[PDB]
Amino acid sequence: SFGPMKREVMEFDPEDPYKVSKMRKLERSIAKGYVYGADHQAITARFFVRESLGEVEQKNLGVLMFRLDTGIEMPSTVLVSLFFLSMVAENVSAATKNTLAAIYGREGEAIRTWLRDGAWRLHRVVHPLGCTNSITPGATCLITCSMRGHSYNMLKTEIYPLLVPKEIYLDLDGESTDEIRFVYFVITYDYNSDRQGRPSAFVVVSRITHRHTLINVLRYRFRVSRFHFLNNSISGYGPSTGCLGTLQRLGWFCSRDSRSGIVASRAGQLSVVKLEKFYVDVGPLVEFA
C-alpha cells in the first residue's frame, strides 16, 4: 500500500556499504568538474609550518611529523620530524646527530636543540602526528599531513614511504620474514645521572601484534637501561624518575618493501630506511618499565 512500498526504496540500495558516499561525491564532481581529494580513503590534514622548520620534509617527501609541548608559552608547539629528534636520542651517531643538526640549525632551530636536549623529553612532549604528502613551498610551508592511511601523491600516483633514519631503526629492527609488518615507536631512557638520561628513541618493526609479548622482546634489548632503571630507584630516595620505556603503534607496511635508502640533503646526505607502502596508523601510548 504505502508503508512497505516506501521501505523497498530504502532497502534496494545494494552492493555498496552505503552508496551514500560514492553517489553523492559524483553529483558534486559532475557539478564542479573532476574533484581531487574525493577518491581518498586515507585521511590527511594541512598544517602551518614555518620556513625554519620547512626543510627536509619539503625536499624528500613522506616522513613523520611530531608535535612539541615545549615548556615556553609563546612557541609552545614546534613541529618535529623523525629526522629531527635524532639530535636528541642516544642511539644516533654524533656525526649523524651533527649532520642533521647542521641541516635544521641554520639560525631558526637551535633553540630546539636547547629546548629538547635541555628541556628534556618526558615522552609526552612528542606526539605522533603523522606522515607527509605534497609540501607547499611558498611564503609559508603548508604540509598536508596524513593521519590514517597511506602517504601518497594526489591522483594516486606514487606511494610515499616512511623515511626512518638508520640509527633509530637497526637497534630495534625485527626479525626477517615476508608478511605484514607493524611499525611501533619506542622511547627508552637510560636513567644514569641527568634526571632523564639521554632519552633514546627507536623505530621498531615487528611481526608481533600483541602488547606484552612485544615488550618482552624489549625486555631482551633494554636490560642495560632496565638495570639502570632499578638503580635510580635506590640511588635517589624521594626523587623518582618515571617510565623506562614507552611504546606506541605508529603504522605498518608490507615488509617485502623494507629496503635501505638515503636522503640527499644539505649538510651532507643521511642514510635512511625506506618503508614503501606505509599505512600510517597511530596507536596509544603504552608506558612500561
Binding site: 607547499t136 613551498p137 611558498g138 611564503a139 609559508t140 610551508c141 603548508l142
Partner: protein, 48 residues
C-alpha cells in the same frame, strides 16, 4: 563581498558575507495656533 586569493602559503580568507541593518530616527513636528472663543462664536451665534 568579493573574493580573491593568491600564492602558496599566503593566508587566504574564507568567504565573508555580511548582513547589516540601519535603524530609524524619529522627530515629529507639532505647531499650535490661536482662535478666539469670541471668533468662533460668530460662526455659531449668527445674529439678525
Amino acid at each position: 563581498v568579493p573574493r580573491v586569493a593568491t600564492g602558496a602559503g599566503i593566508p587566504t580568507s574564507r568567504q565573508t558575507t555580511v548582513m547589516v541593518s540601519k535603524y530609524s530616527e524619529k522627530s515629529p513636528i507639532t505647531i499650535p495656533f490661536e482662535i478666539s472663543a469670541a471668533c468662533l462664536t460668530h460662526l455659531k451665534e449668527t445674529f439678525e
